[PDB]
Design a protein around this ligand. Structure first.
Ligand SMILES: Nc1ccn([C@@H]2O[C@H](COP(=O)(O)OP(=O)(O)OP(=O)(O)O)[C@@H](O)C2(F)F)c(=O)n1
Ligand SMILES: Nc1ccn([C@@H]2O[C@H](COP(=O)(O)OP(=O)(O)OP(=O)(O)O)[C@@H](O)C2(F)F)c(=O)n1
Ligand SMILES: Nc1ccn([C@@H]2O[C@H](COP(=O)(O)OP(=O)(O)OP(=O)(O)O)[C@@H](O)C2(F)F)c(=O)n1
Lengths: 534, 534, 534
């Protein structure tokens, strides 16, 4: 049991799919019975993505231990079974924070603290912490080789390779081999210049992953093999694909996992990708089609809802339904009205913070409730469902969250500390990661999950006000799930409806293409049944 | 009034004297009536030198505003009259701290924080903050061009030069032009390779400062001029010198200040270096010689006492005395005895923290007191003087500091909060920077300073215990200076002695070669008078 | 067995002694019974040094096959017994000539001829041609790594290392580790930046040879070992020495030959350096001293007479005489007269072309003959001796060479085709390399060489005119050596003299420190005997 490291770097351009490639290779190695994990080194100065806005960087992924991480850890969990944690993602910001704090504690004992060895040591420690206890660890280095921002990471992993040796380390380098119409060929010159930059910081690549908008022919792979001084079988073609689920198969067909198993002296059986073959087959052969509207406030960057979009596609796979996801701005509902929600087979309202676009989401939940259009609300999606039912069925005028209108008459959503009733009477912190939720018997979700208890991941501050709940319950709404000693509301259902479910937790973070998700499967099934009735 | 910047970089090796060169050039420009200042950008991760050990990095310099800074700010204050502050020195550590904290306050508004532009912006802001309000600002970049650690600094100052323009910015690059016996010539090839590294990060030097162990001939300067595409008058020879006081004259004689005044369109009169000429003359023509023992715990790196060594040399200049400074380990006095203090014309005990070597310093103060050898104690040097006089004249057995022996019977030195008497009765934070001190009339120091009040700089925690003082005063010791509402003891004198003075403050930080220092002048005079009597 | 290659490169500066170090290592390896050779790759565009002026490049060394080569091949032959040929030296000029010629002969079959692979292939072919059939081949790359001029050489040897493998190739990189008074240490930073330059062109050094004006301490070699990822025993200190004969011993004492033999899996006995120890002992323990004047037209650059200066030193070793070589400009004899030839124990006039300073050499030959000062003339040195004698003893007025005065009455020196007598009556180009010479009985040289025939190396056009020889022989001059069918004069003597010999050939090219040379041994012995008589 000696841990092996595959360092995954990128050259020429940023957007090579380093994460997908690492995840896809991990999927193959896992399918050979190996204990594998992946970690992402981000060269940004942000301590973590907690502060980073959804419409700049994309969604904040949440691990079961409650870490706020890069959305790439979503790819990782959707390609391998090994659970991600805080240890599988860190930034330059985290590393400098670690070192600045170690300096205050006087751990450096009056020494001058330097990029080498102090910053590089801190990086190596975190890679080893995340890596050890595994057969193979894939380490994705963010950025493009040659840029300033990744130089400490590259020096760190260069040092690791010298210490551990070439028997238990590989350098896998993604590169752009672009097509020029003028020459009618793909061009290796960018790979030549990129590999030279890599050599100049003391890294020799073992494996070249050649990204292009078409196949990189054997002739160009042979050229790249010579000038990089690697075997031709270590030069892999990875053309643009219509589905990332095909990538493990494409890499296996070129023997990449065989090459890695030989270099690391791992005797393991052939990769069984039958689950991926099944996923590819399902995706290629949908029986029917549905249009599902996603109504939120961050649609200007789709990656803001990355895991939700994937969870809907997984819902499609399990029902053999093709899902046409229509991203709709909730502010457009406020101004233009509910005319833009017409022609939808189902409606999803995903998570969010701040009041901008929330009123449109409340109107959207009303439209879906009154017109019997299948509805799934996630976090904020549950809040607007509760506000709708409180306002329009329990006749609680201007019911809202304390997040949006702090001094509202009926704060049906509020922090536990803010909980008050309509007269101002009282009783007597971000919830993050995995928590057990108890499901109410005879509820739709109890049926779908087929268990009394489930584990789903949170990222929210504002809870359902239990002081105003019974009034909403008596007006017809049903509590389907609860959690903890405070008996916090986790899931609500509207029963006089074909399919209406809203949850506080983020089920999208537990959905995979191979195992799907009970809520998303149920939701997409309802969308199909609705479409058939029209 | 448009502020001009001279960016001072170094190539080939670290130890080119970038600070001395910057300070020496500043001295010339100041002697032309210009408002000039200097700042040091350090690529270490240490938030500031406060934590850095004296026997690794050298002395912690203290500005009047109480900043703990690089010893280079000592060079700056000894070459120009412009006072240094916190703004004239910052590290990579400070810059990352600034940015990490701005991220928490949400000043970046959900943006991805990047080396460019966020780290480079933070660097530019601090350079502008320290620079603006001056005719010429010299910005010393620590490190060697081509190293990772200085890349953000070099990108920052490259950006500044583009924005401000070539009319108000210059790049001054120090380089090594070494002599090879084999070729019998100095070699420009290192300068060629260094300048290429500079070009590759988008900086073209305006001025080449050629360091060698001998003159760089016109022939080699002409070669460097062509391959750097600068005028030959912008290629300066700076050979190894026996005295740094000569460097302003050597640079002026090659027209460097004329070149800078033309490039910045500054019409100012010829530099009057008559004060530097006087310093050089004094240093070259000492009338007599003295041996002064410096007894401390950090002698293994002389730079630990950099400003004290310079202050003694300045004492020599003002008395026309050559001072032979003998660095003596205080632990050698503890083991080998006072035999190693023989042949000294005077004794100095400088500042320090921790008990290691303190007992030797107490014995050293006793030797100097009993044998009438001129004594100067600085900070710890005053503590061991008080402990000596308390133990051996006031018969206070085992009198000590609470820093060294917390539960001692007579804590003659302690924190204000720890102040107790011998029976345990009571009454009823690092002191940093400039503080007014009141001088007692008929004291030696009142005579030397010739003023009732002085301003000197502190760097100490532990004070003289005023509860045990009167007992030491009545045993003959005299309080010569005090400060503040707590009437803290700043200066003590033993009067039955030719010259015995010890101060809490660090007078070495206010000494210059041009103006000297009253205490050091008096001390070195006493050392000469003692030597004549033997 | 498989031929092993040591590629010898240089960083930081040109003048590291790459040739001396390669030659000194070859001497250690030859002493271990290995078959070793050395070759020099010069990045100049000159087809060969035959065109290059001696005051620009230094001496044109001549191999036994008549090749005009770099003076480094003189170092090679003075350290190893392996004979150099045309194959042991080529330039970029030769490589481009090779390729341009092959192109016109249609050898490339209408292909585009490129730096890679056509120029690099031509370099590799010539390195193999000189190397194959030896145990170890040392390949010296001229220039400084990072310069444009050496990039094709470095790419060629990089390719060879990939093909041949790490089992039979080593990269030995010389670097400058300069001392700084400011730091009181030698600086590894230039080696750091030079090695980064090597890595960027795809070469990893195996051995670092650290040049400095002093020993590079264990601490500094340890830093270099870590940065370069080489073992500490592969980092060698080579300080400046008084004698190059010590360098084999300094390298052996640090185990360099052991490391090379281990890497190449050569089992050979320990080196016995007794021959070098003896040379060092002889050099360190002279018995008497002499001053020998070398009177020529190229003294501006001493390396113009590299092999002659070394031959005189070797003559010193054999006689236990310390030789003070005084370089005298022959043009100074024309202006200031024979005043400057005073206090010389012997006179040597070396080789040269063109009339400038020749009349000064004729005056010098006359001075030495008339005042019985031991004389050795080489090539031009023989011409001026023959001219002196013809003019001043045989009374042949204005006797000269057709090279200098084509239409002179008495062309005593002239081309074979030009041979005429005083009346203009006739009979019915460059000589290069080793030729047999027949020595005359009862001549001084017949005794000294102790053989009837000798082999010496030529580089000359103009011969002794046989049509005017008889007349000069009748006047007392003796012919001591002849060659070929034309019976060309090789050696002349003046018997009415303690020691007066002059030869057409260059005896300095067959002199070594271990074996010496009979002519130079005799010349220095005569200079000693003359000094004792004064
Ligand atoms: N380090 C190097 C490497 C190569 N070349 C030169 O590069 C030239 C070939 O460059 P091309 O015509 O663009 O072709 P290609 O390299 O195959 O690149 P692509 O895959 O994008 O088509 C040779 O003359 C050379 F000479 F080989 C060079 O000058 N320096
Ligand atoms: N970028 C460059 C610049 C120069 N050179 C080549 O560098 C060679 C000259 O290098 P030297 O003999 O060491 O001399 P020097 O440069 O004056 O350096 P020093 O001052 O240390 O003596 C030319 O043939 C060249 F060709 F000019 C080069 O190949 N690439
Ligand atoms: N590629 C590199 C390598 C090092 N350094 C930085 O280089 C700094 C140390 O450089 P020094 O003080 O000049 O010392 P030295 O390297 O031992 O060189 P010498 O042997 O000439 O004294 C570290 O802070 C660093 F950070 F390690 C760097 O920034 N980039």
């Amino acid at each position: 049991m000696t841990t092996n490291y595959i360092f995954v770097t990128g050259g020429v351009v940023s957007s090579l799919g380093k994460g997908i490639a690492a995840a896809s290779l991990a999927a193959i190695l896992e399918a050979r019975g190996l204990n594998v994990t992946i970690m992402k080194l981000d060269p940004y100065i942000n301590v973590d993505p907690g502060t980073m806005s959804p419409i700049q960087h994309g969604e904040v992924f949440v691990t079961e231990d409650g870490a706020e991480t890069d959305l790439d850890l979503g790819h990782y969990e959707r390609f391998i079974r090994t659970k991600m944690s805080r240890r599988n993602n860190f930034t330059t910001g985290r590393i400098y924070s670690d070192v600045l704090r170690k300096e205050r504690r006087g751990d450096y004992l009056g020494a001058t603290v330097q990029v080498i060895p102090h910053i590089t040591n801190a990086i190596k420690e975190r890679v080893l912490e995340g890596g050890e206890g595994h057969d193979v660890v894939l380490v994705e280095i963010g950025g493009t080789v040659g840029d300033i921002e990744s130089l400490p990471f590259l020096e760190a992993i260069r040092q690791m390779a010298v210490e551990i040796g070439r028997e238990h380390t590989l350098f896998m380098h993604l590169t752009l081999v672009p097509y020029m119409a003028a020459s009618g060929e793909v061009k290796t010159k960018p790979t030549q210049h990129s590999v030279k930059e890599l050599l100049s910081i003391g890294i020799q690549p073992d494996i070249l992953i050649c990204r292009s908008d078409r196949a990189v022919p054997a002739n160009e792979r042979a050229k790249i093999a010579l000038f990089c001084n690697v075997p031709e079988k270590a030069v892999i073609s990875l053309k643009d694909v219509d589905s990332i689920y095909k990538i493990p198969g494409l890499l296996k067909s070129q023997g990449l996992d065989d090459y890695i198993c030989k270099r690391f002296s791992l005797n393991c059986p052939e990769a069984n990708l039958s689950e991926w073959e099944q996923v590819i087959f399902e995706e290629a052969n949908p029986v029917s089609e549905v249009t599902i509207g996603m109504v939120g406030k961050y649609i200007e960057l789709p990656d803001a809802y990355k895991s939700v979009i994937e969870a809907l596609k997984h819902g499609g796979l399990k029902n053999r339904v093709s899902v046409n996801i229509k991203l709709i701005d909730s502010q457009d509902v406020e101004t233009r009205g509910v005319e833009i929600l017409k022609g939808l087979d189902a409606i999803l309202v995903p998570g969010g913070f701040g009041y901008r676009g929330v009123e449109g989401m409340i109107t959207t939940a009303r439209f879906a409730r009154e017109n019997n259009i299948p509805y799934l609300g996630i976090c904020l999606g549950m809040q607007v469902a509760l506000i709708d039912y409180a306002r329009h069925v329990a006749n609680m005028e201007n019911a809202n969250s304390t997040e949006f209108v702090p001094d509202c008459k009926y704060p049906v959503v509020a922090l536990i500390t803010e909980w008050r009733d309509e007269n101002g009477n009282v009783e007597v912190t971000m919830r993050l990661g995995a928590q057990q939720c108890q499901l109410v018997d005879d509820s739709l979700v109890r049926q779908l999950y087929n268990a009394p208890t489930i584990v789903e991941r949170h990222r929210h501050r504002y809870e359902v006000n239990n002081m105003l709940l019974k009034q909403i319950e008596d007006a017809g709404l049903r509590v389907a799930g609860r959690s903890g000693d405070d008996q916090l509301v986790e899931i609500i259902e509207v029963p006089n409806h074909p399919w209406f479910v809203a949850c506080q937790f983020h089920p999208e973070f537990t959905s995979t293409p191979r195992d799907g998700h009970p809520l998303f499967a149920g939701f997409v099934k309802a969308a199909s049944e609705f479409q058939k009735r029209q």
